[PDB]
Design a protein around this nucleic acid. Structure first.
Lengths: 534, 644
RNA sequence: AGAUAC
């Protein structure tokens, strides 16, 4: 019926009018059209043999929902419902279905606050206790934390200190460190990000800008499901936290603290003028530390970072008594032990020390503290660093959590950290140590372990033996009656790390006894230290 | 390295079963122990590392049939590590394949469910190189060849598929994965429409993040300035978003939740408050005039496919075999009852009942009816499995009515017309009556028989609350009997049909001989089957449901099988299609159970608002759930979230 | 979370 032909004409035209609306990918609609028309022509033309065989079959529900457009025409012919409107509508619907089929084939990580949706889904409050060392900033927060119903510290020693104080107050607080398991007190790296508490405390919040360690503080700050998040640290952290709290919508209440006691830089130091209560600061340059301490011993009258904790505590108590007079520290003195130091003497200033590090070391003489140098040039360089204003941190260092970079898997991190860079006030880790350990089956643990600690290859060989002991799904190490004892102590500790991570390494209690054996012997070796590997 | 899915049907949770747990979603675990007390009914699982995990049975995501806490047991280490490494390795390719067939199985009009096992079958059977030549037909050839059958499934592909679907769930390509509690295995998953769900949300995210979340800040300004009209016309996609959140449709995408957190955070009155479903609802009312119904899995029409189909149901009109028995001159329901089945013959209303010429299901209303495995009954609304016209016609209610309709049991299409006006209450109250008394006494005899011989055998726009009679004993007992007898007839005539199937164990049995709370965490549940199994609650015999053909699909299918068989025709369904149909029915029944309990919890809690380390409790109020277990003021209640 | 009616 030519009438029907005219109907298909005005209908298809009507469809054009309903295919001239938007440019937002109108091309898809176009292709749909061409496929349509082409399908019609092809239908009638090929129908040369099945014209009637076509024109024999009626429809039902497909008329409201154009199911299979493999053949439109015959249905349009044999239509009988109980006018042109039927035509135009039906074909319009058909086109829509063609768009369902044709707008479908072949047609085609800077918001870390987003990584903790559960934390972003609640009101979180930030309380910033900002100030120098020796300011009382920690105590208000700790007292707020007790009356509640977690503490995150940078050091096993600080976690121990809070544990000890809490135990003395009659209050069962477990301990969770990398190496020790006993409210909850832990290292910031061991914080759970899935346990909805009421109060979390983050100490030394500025270590969020460590190039190598800083991700845990950022992650905890962004992700802790706590009603109150108390952060304690220096004021250099304040603007970023505001920018950070800008991304969470979280209220920020700032509390500022000044030094409880005065501090001053001396004119010029006079090594015989070293004095009781002097702390001579040598950094992790234990060969320098060792040589200096033996020399100063060899006239009249030690803590560094790679010492064990117990030995350090013993050293503090000995120092606090006149069985020890002066002490040599390291930047490891920046935090931890509560030490009664009258006067800081800087041995030196291979890069220059940051103004912040100098300020951190010097504020431990907390009510009048004194600071000087061995050499006058350093004395003035120190006076400059000491009098330098509160340098502000520009950015906060970040690292993908297990969950996220497992999702990325779907040395991949080379790429992940690269696109992380490629937001603007967020840093990528160094992780040079982590990649080193990565130089070395389960993938998940490979990530989980790529954060395990070691030196720069006895540590590397022990690590190999450990990966091998992982592949099979502990002794080779003898001492009886110095660099060797420190290395062995670190391997026994690494063993304690895996044991606290995989109770299926069994040694346990008996291995704890072994640790004390490395510690007493190192201690006695250090007290009697007649030479030193420099 | 494949196993048969039937043994899931054939077995209950057991030692050696390999499972994925909700706690430890990222690793496989192995059932190492059974519930240890009435006091503590939780299971014990061992990880590949050898660490134990304790979990309630409903924490099992998927389950693999087998093929005292001794640390030394390599056995488990080996099974779990092997299958896990293989699945893990298979996975990226599975993600690509998932993306592709998503493009093909998805329907633009709306959400569409799929048998999950079938999906796994498809994922296993497809080669990517060939999937790009004679492509689209190759795929639909791999989909039909998916259906073709042996029926066995590779565990590795199953796991990888599950992981793949969740990861792409983050993109709104797939919906929530539903796991049946009886078999403890995934039954179905919805496939969300590409245009409406993927592109729409992606566009929304870019639009909302654009110009440093300019659109968000501007919006929060508008909400703060209370000029809701502009919101209406310009920002309706955000109302859409909040609604989609309220329905629990996008509850699992973390990004839409952070975005929404920023939106709430920027709005003054709601500022610093918990992000909840309830909050999105409350926020929405404050902006729209006059939310569980919005759920995509809840096949409510408001949904383009459910609206098309309901448009078919609105527009539909239905050779009665003289070979039918006439019952001559010879129903306890509520007053407010819709369909009266007590048995009606809706199957007669379909051509498939008599037409053995065309194989499978050809009729549109029939096919739709089967997709809706049941009538959907909620306090809010009703979605009948059958169209209104056909229910009005076929319902049994003084009317010519087409039909299918010690102690000893005598083992060896209709017409009816006399229909007495009666109700459950009316039945309870008090010649025909004498017949009724004989019947109640008979029912009591049926129950007594079932009990003593078959070792046969929780209540409580305007919400109202309520809390079992002689009448109920009567109906239930005669329904159970009818269904057992028809089970027997089908089995004996070899007709394939859709069937319905420690100190703690002793304590349970003693309790069997108030405080059913303590028994409740040791529950068995019902499941549908393509082969006969005893329903051990009702007795020791097979159970085949024929009593509710207008509100239950399996009964309807049983009715078609009876129609074809009785007129000595070839049966409508061979065992294999019976299995497929059965899987779909189980999926939609589970889904309904979930949304029923969701809605009841929502309303109960909303009424409350208007008025075994588990810290679970209950009210007197059955569905308000939030050391001495079973023994006999809160902070917050948000009903849409299910928080109490 | 089992069972009948809906």
């Amino acid at each position: 019926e030519f009438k029907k032909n005219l109907e298909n004409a005005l209908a298809h035209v009507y469809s054009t009018q309903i295919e001239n609306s938007a440019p937002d990918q109108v091309e898809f609609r176009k292709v749909a059209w061409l496929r349509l028309k082409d399908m019609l022509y092809n239908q009638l033309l090929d129908k040369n043999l099945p014209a009637k065989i076509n024109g024999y079959d009626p429809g039902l529900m497909e008329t409201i929902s154009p199911t299979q457009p493999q053949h439109i025409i015959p249905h349009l012919v044999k239509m009988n419902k109980i006018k042109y409107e039927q035509f135009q509508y039906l074909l319009s619907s058909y086109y829509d279905c063609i768009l369902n089929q044709e707008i479908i084939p072949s047609m085609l990580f800077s918001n870390p606050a987003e990584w903790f949706p559960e934390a972003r889904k609640i009101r979180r409050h930030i309380i910033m206790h900002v100030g120098p060392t020796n300011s009382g900033k920690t105590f208000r927060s700790l007292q707020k934390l007790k009356a509640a119903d977690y503490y995150a510290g940078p050091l096993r020693l600080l976690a121990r200190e809070v544990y000890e104080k809490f135990k003395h107050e009659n209050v069962r607080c477990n301990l969770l460190t990398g190496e020790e398991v006993i409210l909850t007190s832990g290292t910031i790296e061991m914080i759970p990000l899935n346990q909805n508490f009421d109060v979390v405390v983050l100490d030394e919040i500025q270590m969020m800008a460590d190039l190598d360690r800083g991700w845990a503080w950022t992650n905890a700050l962004l992700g802790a499901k706590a009603k109150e998040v108390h952060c304690c640290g220096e004021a250099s952290t304040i603007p970023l936290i505001k920018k950070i709290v800008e991304m969470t919508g979280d209220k920020l209440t700032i509390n500022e603290y000044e030094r409880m006691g005065k501090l001053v830089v001396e004119e010029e130091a006079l090594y015989h003028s070293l004095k009781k209560g002097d702390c001579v600061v040598a950094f992790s340059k234990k060969a320098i530390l060792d040589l200096k301490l033996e020399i100063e011993k060899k006239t009249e009258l030690v803590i560094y970072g790679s010492l064990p904790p117990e030995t350090r505590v013993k050293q503090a108590n000995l120092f606090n008594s006149g069985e020890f007079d002066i002490l040599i520290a390291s930047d490891a003195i920046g935090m931890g032990l509560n030490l009664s130091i009258d006067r800081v003497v800087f041995t030196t200033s291979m890069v220059d020390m940051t103004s912040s590090a100098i300020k951190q070391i010097g504020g431990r003489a907390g009510p009048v503290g004194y600071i000087t140098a061995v050499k006058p040039n350093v004395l003035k360089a120190v006076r400059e660093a000491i009098n330098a204003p509160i340098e502000y941190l520009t950015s906060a260092t970040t690292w993908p959590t297990d969950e996220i970079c497992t999702h990325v898997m779907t040395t991949l991190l080379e790429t992940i950290a690269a696109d992380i860079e490629q937001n603007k006030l967020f840093q990528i880790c160094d992780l040079k140590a982590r990649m080193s350990a990565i130089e070395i089956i389960t993938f998940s643990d490979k990530l989980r372990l790529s954060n395990a600690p070691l030196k720069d290859p006895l540590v590397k060989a022990a690590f190999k033996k450990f990966c091998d002991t992982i592949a099979r799904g502990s002794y080779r190490p003898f001492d009886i009656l110095l660099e060797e004892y420190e290395a062995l102590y670190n391997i026994i500790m690494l063993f304690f790390w895996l044991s606290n991570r995989y109770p299926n390494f069994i040694d346990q209690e008996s291995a704890s006894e072994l640790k004390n054996f490395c510690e007493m012997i190192i201690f006695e070796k250090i007290d009697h230290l007649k030479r030193n590997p420099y | 390295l494949s196993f048969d899915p039937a043994e899931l049907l054939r077995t209950s949770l057991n030692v050696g079963d390999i499972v994925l747990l909700k706690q430890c979603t990222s690793e496989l675990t192995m059932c190492v122990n059974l519930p240890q007390s009435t006091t503590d009914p939780r299971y014990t699982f061992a990880k590949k590392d050898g660490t134990l995990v304790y979990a309630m049975k409903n924490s099992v995501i998927l389950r693999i049939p087998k093929d005292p806490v001794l640390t030394r047991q390599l056995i488990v280490s080996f099974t779990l590590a092997t299958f896990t490494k293989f699945a893990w390795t298979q996975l990226p390719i599975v993600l690509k394949k998932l993306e592709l067939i998503h493009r093909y199985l998805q329907d633009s009009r709306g959400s569409k469910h799929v048998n999950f096992m079938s999906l796994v079958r498809i994922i296993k059977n497809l080669n990517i190189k060939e999937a790009t030549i004679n492509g689209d037909a190759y795929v639909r050839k791999v989909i039909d060849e998916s259906m073709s059958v042996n029926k066995s499934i590779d565990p590795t592909t199953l796991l990888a598929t599950y992981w793949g679907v969740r990861e792409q769930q983050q993109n709104n390509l797939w919906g929530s994965v539903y796991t049946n509690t009886a078999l403890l295995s995934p039954t179905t998953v919805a496939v969300l429409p590409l245009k409406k769900a993927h592109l729409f949300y992606q566009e929304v995210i870019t639009r909302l993040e654009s110009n440093d979340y300019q659109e968000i800040k501007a919006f929060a300004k508008l909400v703060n300035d209370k000029d809701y009209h502009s919101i209406a016309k310009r920002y309706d996609y955000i109302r859409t978003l909040l609604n989609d959140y309220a329905a629990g449709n996008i509850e699992e995408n973390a990004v839409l939740t952070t975005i929404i957190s920023k939106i709430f955070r920027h709005i003054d009155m709601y500022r610093d408050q918990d992000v909840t479903r309830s909050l999105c609802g409350k926020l929405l009312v404050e902006i729209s005039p006059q939310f569980i119904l919005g759920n995509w899995d809840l096949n409510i029409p408001k949904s383009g496919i459910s609206s098309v189909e309901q448009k078919l149901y609105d527009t539909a009109m239905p050779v009665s075999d003289t070979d039918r028995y006439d019952f001559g001159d010879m129903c306890i329901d509520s007053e407010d009852a819709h369909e009266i089945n007590d048995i009606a013959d809706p199957a007669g209303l379909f051509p498939e009942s008599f037409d053995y010429t065309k194989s499978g299901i050809s009729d549109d209303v029939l096919r739709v009816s089967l997709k809706r495995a049941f009538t959907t009954y909620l306090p809010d609304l009703v979605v009948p499995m059958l169209p209104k016209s056909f229910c009005n016609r076929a319902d049994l209610g003084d009317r010519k009515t087409e039909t299918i309709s010690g102690l000893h049991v005598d083992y060896d299409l209709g017409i009816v017309s006399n229909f007495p006006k009666v109700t459950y209450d009316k039945v309870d109250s008090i010649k025909q009556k004498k017949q009724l008394e004989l019947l109640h006494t008979l029912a009591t005899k049926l129950l007594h028989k079932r009990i003593h011989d078959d070792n046969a055998v929780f209540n409580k726009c305007i919400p109202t609350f309520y809390d079992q009679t002689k009448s109920t004993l009567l109906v239930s007992e005669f329904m159970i009997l009818t269904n057992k007898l028809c089970a027997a007839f089908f089995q004996e005539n070899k007709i394939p049909g859709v069937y319905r199937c420690n100190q703690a164990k002793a304590q349970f049995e003693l309790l069997k001989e108030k405080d059913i709370t303590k028994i409740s965490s040791q529950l068995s549940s019902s499941f549908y089957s393509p082969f006969p199994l005893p329903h051990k609650m009702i007795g020791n015999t097979a159970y085949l449901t024929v009593t509710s053909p207008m509100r239950r699909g399996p009964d309807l299918i049983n009715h078609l099988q009876l129609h074809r068989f009785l007129k000595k025709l070839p049966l409508c369904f061979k065992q294999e299609y019976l299995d497929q149909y059965v899987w779909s029915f189980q999926a939609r029944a589970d889904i309904l159970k979930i949304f029923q309990r969701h809605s009841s919890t929502y309303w109960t809690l909303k009424h409350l608002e208007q008025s075994n380390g588990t810290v679970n409790c209950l009210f007197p109020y059955s569905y308000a759930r939030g050391p001495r277990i079973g023994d006999t003021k809160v902070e917050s209640i948000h009903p849409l979230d299910g928080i109490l």
